[PDB]
């Protein structure tokens, strides 16, 4: 019941500062422009200890499955090959990605009827707000 309030199908309804986040991560111009148009569906499910997060989008479809606290390989929507670890901290899913000596942290939280995704790279934050589909 660990992630019950996250489970479901969610649709992006607003974004702030995403272009700058992507720049900070190292995403190139064309990818930033195409990725920034997308309005993804995020589908979160749990089966036993395994959490699955899918992103269905006109840009890229992605899928990760993981156990909390257990590192895994991830290929991100912008084609970084990263090592990821996701934990639950005070009810927030905290996702750290490491690659090439760099790090970014993605927090996913339930706030009212929304699922808020906060993406941080050094000093740069982007906030992505999802609602139930
Ligand atoms: O789409 C989102 O709302 C969230 C997201 O799918 C997971 C968290 C990180 C940002 C984003 C992935 C992502 C990362 C770099 C370049 C383009 C993209 Cl699309």
Swiss-Prot record:
N-terminal signal peptide = none
> Where is the protein situated, by its record's location annotation?
Cytoplasm; Nucleus
| UniProt similarity note | Belongs to the calycin superfamily. Fatty-acid binding protein (FABP) family.
Q: Cite the InterPro entries for this sequence.
A: Calycin (IPR012674), Fatty_acid-bd (IPR000463), ILBP (IPR031259), Lipocln_cytosolic_FA-bd_dom (IPR000566)
Keyword Phosphoprotein tagged: yes
Q: Where is this motif: Nuclear localization signal?
A: 23-33
Name the predominant localization. Answer: cytoplasm
Annotated domain remarks: Forms a beta-barrel structure that accommodates hydrophobic ligands in its interior.
N-acetylcysteine is found on: 3
Residues modified as Phosphotyrosine are 21
Q: What does this protein do?
A: Lipid transport protein in adipocytes. Binds both long chain fatty acids and retinoic acid. Delivers long-chain fatty acids and retinoic acid to their cognate receptors in the nucleus.
What quaternary arrangement does the UniProt entry report?
Monomer. Homodimer. Interacts with PPARG.
Name any one Pfam family assigned in the record.
Answer: Lipocalin
Which gene carries the instructions for this protein?
Answer: FABP4
Q: What name goes with this protein?
A: Fatty acid-binding protein, adipocyte
| The keyword Hydrolase belongs to this UniProt entry's keyword annotation | no
Q: Give the modified residues of type Phosphoserine.
A: 14
Q: PROSITE patterns of this UniProt entry?
A: FABP
Chain positions recorded as a fatty acid binding sites: 128-130
State what changing residue 24 to D does: In a breast cancer sample; somatic mutation
